[PDB]
Design a protein around this ligand. Structure first.
Ligand code: K0G
Length: 152
């Protein structure tokens, strides 16, 4: 059948919101009140891939944009990019592996691991107005945990 998707926002565990930073980048900053309309709304698709109780393969598209978070090697490093696709063909159930994140439940938060690059995670910096990036540490310094808000 079709692929199933939910509209949502994400916030890092320090409660920073995600906004656009030019056409192909996201940044995280502390946001409240009027400025909260600036936050990115995702379409989270539930895609084909290896699955367990607490590990669910998803794609993260931007709502009503032909843009997806993807994980590629850039200058020889695993790298988070926003990638354009053909809007006739997306979303789909069998998303290409660079688009797939393993959603994980851990102590009432979420981590998003790259399916392509094991133990690389969607990450934010402690500092305000810095890029969202792919980090090879779910350890300490950079933030790898999130809450989800379900949007109408
Ligand atoms: O919403 C969550 N998981 C989920 C998301 C989409 C579909 C099915 C399950 N987890 C969660 C837990 C604590 C704070 N924020 C989010």
């Amino acid at each position: 059948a079709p692929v199933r998707s939910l509209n949502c926002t994400l916030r890092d565990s320090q409660q920073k919101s995600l906004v656009m930073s030019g056409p192909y980048e996201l940044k995280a900053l502390h946001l409240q009140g009027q400025d909260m309309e600036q936050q990115v709304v995702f379409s989270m698709s539930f895609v084909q891939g290896e699955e367990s109780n607490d590990k669910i393969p998803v794609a993260l598209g931007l709502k009503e944009k032909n843009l997806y978070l993807s994980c590629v090697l850039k200058d020889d490093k695993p790298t988070l990019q926003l990638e354009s696709v053909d809007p006739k063909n997306y979303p789909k159930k069998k998303m290409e592996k660079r688009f797939v994140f393993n959603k994980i439940e851990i102590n009432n938060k979420l981590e998003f691991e790259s399916a392509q690059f094991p133990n690389w995670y969607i990450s934010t910096s402690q500092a305000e107005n810095m890029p969202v990036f792919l980090g090879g540490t779910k350890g300490g310094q950079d933030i790898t945990d999130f809450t989800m808000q379900f949007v109408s």
